[PDB]
Scaffold this active site. Structure first.
Site, PDB file in Angstrom:
ATOM      1  N   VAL A   1      76.005  48.284  83.064  1.00 12.96           N
ATOM      2  CA  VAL A   1      75.216  47.914  81.888  1.00 12.96           C
ATOM      3  C   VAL A   1      75.919  48.456  80.643  1.00 12.96           C
ATOM      4  CG1 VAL A   1      73.041  48.027  80.684  1.00 12.96           C
ATOM      5  CG2 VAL A   1      73.064  48.255  83.144  1.00 12.96           C
TER       6      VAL A   1
ATOM      7  N   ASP B   1      60.520  46.395  91.720  1.00 15.54           N
ATOM      8  CA  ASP B   1      61.286  47.639  91.740  1.00 15.54           C
ATOM      9  C   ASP B   1      61.069  48.419  90.442  1.00 15.54           C
ATOM     10  OD1 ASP B   1      63.022  49.549  92.767  1.00 15.54           O
ATOM     11  OD2 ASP B   1      64.836  48.580  91.883  1.00 15.54           O
TER      12      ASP B   1
END
Ligand SMILES: COc1ncnc2[nH]cnc12
Length: 294
Positions: free
Chosen positions: A18, A123
């Site tokens: 990321v 999640d």
């Protein structure tokens, strides 16, 4: 990608690195999420494409999807902190209850919105709950699980945490529901209050057994059908249920009542995000602006 300047590696995500990046044509500062080989399946592209319209102020905005040279990047609204880091920072003193209450209420609005469209997260975890300077909190990576799966290990082979996983997932249910997100958020609520993870399992059986030690080993009385689930074993140890008063002191009666409903074993009886929003715990909810150092 040559539309962006990466700024820094931010994180290792579930699916890929990321990056913080800047759009060269618009100035926008974004989060870029690489999604880790026969190209991207067409089903995943269509699922992701639906998430572009699932917009809500407590859902991190999906800006764009970049698919080039059969490499996939998701472009997201950038937020400067996450709840995992914020909890670690507030360890000495604890997050003040009004702020806990506001974050839980906002997260529940996020969930109520997504679940009204039958979209799950699947999640939820502190590292996924991102926070800004205006007192907002937002769910990141909503719906990526359905699009890409939830791996046992990430691309960096980091273990995907089990700590927030609902018991029906652990017991092998095939067709679990929006209730799984409520369970996760309940575990997060408890962690905010106590300053310690509720169920920090380090294996699937350790996760389940931590759940059972606190909530009681489930049986057909509290969860009809449980003994028929694929990974249910008659030989599970039988723990008695603990009082929430022991589990989440100094949480008040309203918050303990809500938490108990978010952690109900039976996913049918577990409270919905919509119903949770009406709970008396939120009668006096406010929106405090947290103390953030950037
Ligand atoms: C680490 O992941 C992220 N960090 C900052 N902003 C984000 N937006 C979506 N994911 C983000």
């Amino acid at each position: 990608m040559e539309n962006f300047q990466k700024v820094e590696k931010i994180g290792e995500g579930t699916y890929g690195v990321v990056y913080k990046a800047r759009n060269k044509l618009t100035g926008e500062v974004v989060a870029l999420k690489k999604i880790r080989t026969e190209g991207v399946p067409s089903t995943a592209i269509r699922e992701i494409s639906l998430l572009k319209e699932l917009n809500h102020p407590n859902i991190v905005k999906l800006l764009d999807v970049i698919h080039t040279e059969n490499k996939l990047y998701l472009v997201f609204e950038f937020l400067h902190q996450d709840l995992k880091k914020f909890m670690d920072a507030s360890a000495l003193t604890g997050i003040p209850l009004p702020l806990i209450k506001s974050y839980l209420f906002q997260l529940l609005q996020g969930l109520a919105f997504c679940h009204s469209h039958r979209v799950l997260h699947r999640d939820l975890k502190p590292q996924n709950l991102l926070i800004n300077t205006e007192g907002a909190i937002k769910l990141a990576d909503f719906g990526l699980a359905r699009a890409f799966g939830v791996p046992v290990r990430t691309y960096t082979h980091e273990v995907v945490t089990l700590w927030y996983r609902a018991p029906e997932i652990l017991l092998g249910c095939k067709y679990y529901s929006t209730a799984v997100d409520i369970w996760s958020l309940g575990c997060i609520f408890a962690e905010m209050v106590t300053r310690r993870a509720l169920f920090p399992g380090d294996s699937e059986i350790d996760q389940l057994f931590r759940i059972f030690r606190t909530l009681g080993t489930p049986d057909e009385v509290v969860w009809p059908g449980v003994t028929s689930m694929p990974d249910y074993k008659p030989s599970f140890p039988k723990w008695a249920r603990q009082d929430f008063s022991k589990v989440v002191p100094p949480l008040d009666e309203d918050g303990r009542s809500l938490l108990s409903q978010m952690l109900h074993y039976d996913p049918n009886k577990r409270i919905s995000a919509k119903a949770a929003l009406a709970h008396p715990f939120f009668q006096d909810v406010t929106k405090p602006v947290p103390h953030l150092r950037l």
